[PDB]
Symmetry: C2
Subunit: 274 residues, 2 copies
């Protein structure tokens, strides 16, 4: 069976690079039960605080590579190296909040502290997986620490998220009040990233053109070097699987998969033994 290019760019030219879609597994057509958007949207009054005088900002006259950058210091330090990749010592377990530079800062738009706001740079592909529906894979090698893409969708309250029936594309920001990003109806390429028990990207909370603490933006960075063709995936979290295990089990195929039918049934047998 051939692997056919079925869409040149699922983002319709809104990203820095195209994101083609292929399917070499089955007859499923290019997904169109959603609206691709490249930045977060709202479907009710969110009215994000964009008061330019409320922004914390830096006075750097260099490229913000020094430790004196105020925006770096809000982030604990700037975690981006000269190439725009997270430092090796970046805490991948509990990532800090990143405050990138913004339109109030005295620095230039190409300073060293603007990775996420500059958007997608790697070549990604929407593709049909063997067992997990659509997935996202890399069309190039990707060094550890590289920005991949943002988790984009519909900004909704936690109260609205409880009312909704489908939470397969719901990212909980886990804040004031808790807000969420629902990519079910509006979303970007990130809505297609599957859960992996052996993940190779991590989500990081980031602030850029606003600092409304209700709405961090989710940025995915590679947690290791990634090879061309590798599926990208992050750990959806135990909380997701404690809910979804009742309906479906993990198909990541990892030798250490934690949420497979086999892993679940082995645990039940262990608990019944004891």
């Amino acid at each position: 069976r051939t692997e056919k290019i079925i869409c040149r760019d699922v983002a319709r030219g809104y990203e820095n690079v195209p994101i083609p879609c292929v399917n070499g597994v089955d007859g499923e057509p290019c997904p169109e039960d959603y609206k691709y958007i490249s930045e977060n949207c709202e479907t009710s009054t969110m009215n994000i605080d964009r008061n330019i005088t409320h922004l914390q900002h830096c006075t750097c006259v260099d490229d913000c590579s020094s430790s004196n950058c105020l925006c770096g210091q809000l982030s604990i330090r700037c975690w981006y190296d000269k190439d725009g990749r997270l430092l090796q010592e970046f805490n991948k377990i509990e990532p800090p909040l990143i405050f990138e530079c913004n339109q109030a800062c005295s620095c230039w738009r190409n300073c060293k502290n603007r990775v996420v706001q500059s958007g997608i740079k790697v070549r990604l592909q929407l593709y049909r997986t063997a067992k997990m529906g659509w997935g996202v894979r890399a069309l190039q090698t990707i060094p550890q620490g590289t920005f991949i893409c943002e988790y984009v969708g519909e900004l909704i309250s936690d109260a609205e998220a409880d009312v909704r029936e489908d939470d397969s594309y719901l990212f909980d920001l886990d804040n004031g009040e808790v807000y969420c990003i629902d990519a079910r109806y509006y979303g970007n390429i990130s809505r297609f990233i599957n859960h992996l028990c052996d993940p190779n990207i991590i989500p990081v909370r980031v602030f850029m053109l606003h600092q409304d603490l209700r709405f961090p933006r989710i940025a995915f960075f590679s947690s290791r070097d990634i090879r061309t063709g590798e599926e990208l995936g992050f750990d959806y979290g135990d909380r997701f699987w404690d809910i979804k295990s009742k309906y479906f089990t993990c198909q990541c195929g990892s030798e250490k998969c934690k949420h497979s039918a086999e892993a679940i049934a082995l645990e039940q047998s262990r608990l019944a033994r004891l």
Copy 2:
């Protein structure tokens, strides 16, 4: 004989598609720094702009949005941009229609033909010291008629806030003829447009455009050329009679045009007529 100095390589700090350098060959005035350059409109208090994506009217075009089926063209009467992104010659410059560009809700691609203003500055401009009008903005290249030049960018304020403020030299009144009245004040926050002087023979016109939102209280102001512009020509629009009817006591128009309606000589002769 003073010579011209380059005093800033880019007053926009890399926020526009192209640099906008600043030169001075007239006096000792340094690069202006009594304001904050911003490439897009800002807020300093809540304007509650309607950004609900479901309120966007939008088109269902698969083509490049050149057909008369494009609802966005239809909301704009028609799409007024030719294949190269320029306003059609029959565009009404006296009474421009509202332009509705395509948006994130449209089914079309980001490169369709109805996205000129949202794609930003493409012409090369230069901030420079003029002889009698302070800072001005001139072209570094031929600019054919109908070309988008730049947006009038600044701080969104209410009608009430505008009346309180003292300096109205950088205040663009959106001239909302229906409901709530708002202004763009580029005094404290603004882009290259804050430096565009008045000309009685103007070569650019302001057009009210909607792009990522369709809150009719907050049109965005887009400058398009009204004639071919040669390299070195100063850019300028018509501030309107209401401006010079106020400012003429303190200064008069220094555009030097034969058509000048606001020079000292024009004022005197008109009253004699």
